[PDB]
Design a protein around this nucleic acid. Sequence first.
RNA 1: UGGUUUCUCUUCAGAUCGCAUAAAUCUUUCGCCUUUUACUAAAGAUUUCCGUGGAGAGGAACAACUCUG
RNA 2: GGCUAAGAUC
RNA 3: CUCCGAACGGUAAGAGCCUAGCAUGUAGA
Lengths: 30, 36, 133, 18, 162, 103, 320
Amino acid sequence: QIPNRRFTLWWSPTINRANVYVGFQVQLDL
Amino acid sequence: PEHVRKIIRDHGDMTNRKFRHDKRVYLGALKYMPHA
Amino acid sequence: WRVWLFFMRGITPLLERWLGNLLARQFEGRVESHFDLELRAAVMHDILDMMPEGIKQNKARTILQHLSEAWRCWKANIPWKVPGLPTPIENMILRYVKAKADWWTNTAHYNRERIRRGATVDKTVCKKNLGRL
Amino acid sequence: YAEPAHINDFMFEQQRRT
Amino acid sequence: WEDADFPILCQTCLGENPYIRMTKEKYGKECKICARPFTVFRWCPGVRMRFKKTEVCQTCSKLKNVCQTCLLDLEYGLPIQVRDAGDMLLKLARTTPYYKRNRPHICSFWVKGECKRGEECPYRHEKPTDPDDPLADQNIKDRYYGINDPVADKLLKRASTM
Amino acid sequence: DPDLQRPDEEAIKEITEKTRVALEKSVSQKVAAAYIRYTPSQQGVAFNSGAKQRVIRMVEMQKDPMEPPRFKINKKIPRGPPSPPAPVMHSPSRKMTVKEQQE
Amino acid sequence: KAPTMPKPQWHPPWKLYRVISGHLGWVRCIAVEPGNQWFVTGSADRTIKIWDLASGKLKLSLTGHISTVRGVIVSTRSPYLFSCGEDKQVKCWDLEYNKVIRHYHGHLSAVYGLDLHPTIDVLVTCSRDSTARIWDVRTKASVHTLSGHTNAVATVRCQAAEPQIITGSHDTTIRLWDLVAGKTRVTLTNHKKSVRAVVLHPRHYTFASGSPDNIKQWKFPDGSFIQNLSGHNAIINTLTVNSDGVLVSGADNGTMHLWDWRTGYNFQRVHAAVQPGSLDSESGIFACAFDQSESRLLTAEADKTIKVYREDDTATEETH
RNA sequence: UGGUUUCUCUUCAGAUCGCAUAAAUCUUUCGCCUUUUACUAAAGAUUUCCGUGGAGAGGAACAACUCUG
RNA sequence: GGCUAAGAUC
RNA sequence: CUCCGAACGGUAAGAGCCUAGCAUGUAGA
């Protein structure tokens, strides 16, 4: 899970946007 | 005759006009809807 | 108008079964191991019926353990049988072992015929089909 | 102990109420 | 589940006439004696009566041996707390029952003064009972079970008066 | 011929007609879900005297044929968990032989 | 010295005419078509295959079960070759399209046997979970759960003469559960072994019964023990009886003892052979039923060979 | 011989019963496939629904206009 | 106490 | 060339306090 965590965090603006996932408004915390 | 115009007039009253003990049968008998 | 009148003509028998249970819950309130268990329970049913010579200190799980050690000895293709036993008890044990060998060989050839492409999905059946062959 | 009868309900309800 | 064929009721609740009429509703009315649906048997006791129905369950009333509507007893008429106390049932019993067991309910519009129904009012336009007495403070299991029975308490207390 | 007699074909057809009517009543009950006079011998002595038959008409109330059920699944006990335990009386069980443990 | 000893019944011995061996595994059920043309017989390969009743050649192969096919009841009142599989599924394979048409369910374990009633439109599926099941034909629903057995209900009998349904329980107690009520009207004070066999001779007498150890006859009205069986101590699994007075008993040891339904003495009592590919002690008659023409007997052995036994005329077989 | 209608209930329907035509289920097939239902349509047979056909039973309207013979 | 690939196993 | 898809696999996890649109229609004296 450790190399999977570094790869998912590196492409965080590419893998988490409005075009890549359409219907979503989830906020994490404050 | 014009009897159906009076019965459907009492729709959402506060248990005093066709709503005391008939609201359970009103949503259950209407579950045969698409045949109508 | 003709197509959508037939749409409700097909949904009127449907929706009484679709939304029939939905209006009812508001007032009513809502593998191969089975063949191994059925062969094991029928073996105990046959051993308790096919001549136990009455109530004369009859068999137990050790007789089923004798059938278990006979299948494990045949599984490695070893010539080790189960010697030192009565002849009808050994014949009843060898009959269920020859029938279980027919089930396991047919289950091996069925998975191998679907091993080329078959289903394009195999989680633990790939290790079992390679071990059986 | 139940014991039904095959009498008419119309004549029985009329005679008892009279 | 829970079916029935004939109501096990008393002769007082059956009506003051040899001929009556019953109405059977199979698996309904939610009988609170066993929390199971029973055959609700409605009937008419007579002219100007209450026209009540069955309240207790069928199998739940068999162990108690009481009426289906009055739920007092089978032969004597004392409550279940008075029947399980003790013949004691011979002296506490009373034949020729009162019409208050078959009397209808009171008119709430007559208690409020605005009784607009008039002489055709099926309810009784009389004075209600005194709420200070424990006789109008019973419950479901308080009348069925012998625990906390106000009617059985006064029946054993008034039996030794003289 | 009287000891090994066979039943009549009309009696078999009458048993078949009664079984077909009983199975149709159970099938109509499965597809739906998925006067009288009792003599008051309990306390009838003097209260409302003269009631020798106590006739009560059994009029089934026609319920609405479009409704949810009036209660939930019934959690009441329908019957008794004791049985009529009929005895076996098949054969006297005894020991076979002294060599039965060796055979 | 014995009663009715010097006047027995007439029974000429039989002879095997053809041993068809096409299945792959132990055959557990065998049945003949009422038109004497088809011969339905299951196997352990989960495939109920029909063959010619007279020619013996293969006619069809119908699979679909997920376990051993331990029951094949070809319906004579309707074209539907219903079958009982051990995978908790009474697959009613209708022969109108050679496919499953009903696929009824409800049993919690394997089904032992199935019998179609001649009068009532229902199928008595003797399951093995805890009881049998009265499945309604062309309704896909059960009628009543005749729970009157302390073990698996192996045998089943649906007679028009008997008002109840004769169920054969493996708890050494046969029962006659009524069709309308469901409770056992009368038990059986015999069959000390696990009773897994039943027969019926409606030609000139009442329906009999059977047992592996100490078998005995019975009667259709409320049961009546007429006489016990001969010296057959093996585990009997097949019990057929013809209208000519023959009584065939198929045991698991391979000793196919044939006796008389009236005399009771074993006429032939011959033992069959085995397949060359099979083991030494593997031949056992698991299912046996006579033909529709009552000429050639058919017994499905456990050695993967459906053997057919024809008749033969002889006279030097007098019993003392 | 003697009745045009209308509404209730009892069977079989092998007639394009329907001069037009829905849904679900079961057994086999294809396409996507990523967990599943909603999926695409080729074959066959099982229900439900929209409906209907002859022939006895009970009410209402002029059954009396006198219909065929 | 059964079936699972001496169940794979230093 | 004009054949247009919907849901689940998703927002957590908890502590103290605060306010609400709901339901039953009884036998008894």
